[PDB]
A paper describes a structure:
Recently, powerful evidence has verified that Pks13 is an essential enzyme in the mycolic acid biosynthesis pathway, and Pks13 has been extensively studied as a drug target for TB. The overall Pks13 topological structure has the order ACP-KS-AT-ACP-TE. The meromycoloyl chain on the N-ACP domain is transferred to the KS domain, and the intermediate product α-alkyl β-ketothioester is produced by a Claisen-type condensation reaction with another substrate, the carboxyacyl-CoA loaded by the AT domain.
We have determined the 2.59 Å high-resolution crystal structure of a partial AT domain from the M. tuberculosis Pks13 protein. Then, the crystals were solved, and the N-terminal sequence was identified by mass spectrometry, the results of which were in line with the phase presented by the Se-Met crystal dataset. These results indicated that the crystallized protein was actually proteolyzed to become a fragment (Ala717 to Arg826). The overall structure of the core motif contains a long α helix, five short α helixes and two short η turns, in the order of α1-α2-α3-α4-η1-η2-α5-α6, which constitutes a compact motif. The crystallized core motif ranging from Leu717 to Arg826 represents approximately one-third of the AT domain, and the overall crystal structure displays a fold similar to the reported AT domain. Although sequence alignment showed 100% identity between the core motif and the AT domain, the secondary structure elements presented a slight conformational change from residues Ala796 to Ser801, for which refinement indicated two η turns instead of the β strand highlighted by red dashed square line. In our work, the topographic conformation of Ala796 to Ser801 was transformed into two relatively disordered η turns, along with the conformational change of the position of Ser801 dislocating from the substrate. Furthermore, the side chain of the binding site Arg826 was also stretched to the reverse side of α5 and lost its interaction with Gln773. According to a close view of the superimposition, some particular apolar contacts among α1 (His723, Leu730) and the long α4 (Gln773, Ile779, Gln780, and Leu783) and α5 (Ile823) residues all contribute to the stabilization of the unique state. The nucleophilic elbow of α10 and β5 also transformed from an electropositive state to an electronegative state which indicates an unsuitable state to absorb a substrate. In summary, the conformational change of residues from Ala796 to Ser801 and the rearrangement of residues Gln773, Ser801, and Arg826 might all suggest that the degraded fragment formed a unique crystal packing state to survive proteolysis.
Residue numbers in the entry: 717 to 827
The structure:
């Protein structure tokens, strides 16, 4: 729970029962595991309450990247169908052309 509890429920159920969504969740989880120590996939699956600002932002970030890329897999520009619902980082990735790498290390900080 906390902020993005629904993002975590939806993200877990989608990770289990959708291979594209799961592929993107893994793709982001490796990147955060490179930029940080922990793993976002652990946090999503282990549906624990999260009041930490950074880890919540990272969870919502990965969930939105995977949902947006799942929509893109069905042939729609993600910023055109859920652009208003994106966080600063996911929107920076889908609308600002920011690389997933720079986005991941942008939400981590730590500075």
């Amino acid at each position: 729970a906390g902020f993005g509890a629904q993002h975590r429920k939806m993200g877990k159920s989608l990770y289990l029962r959708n291979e594209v969504f799961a592929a993107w969740i893994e793709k982001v989880d490796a990147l955060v595991q490179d930029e940080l120590g922990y793993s976002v996939l652990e946090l999503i699956l282990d549906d624990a309450q999260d009041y930490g600002i950074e880890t919540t932002q990272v969870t919502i970030f990965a969930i939105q990247i995977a949902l947006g890329e799942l929509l893109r897999h069905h042939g729609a520009k993600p910023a055109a169908v859920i652009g208003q619902s994106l966080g600063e980082a996911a929107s920076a990735y889908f609308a600002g052309g920011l690389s997933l790498r720079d986005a991941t290390r942008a939400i981590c900080s730590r500075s």
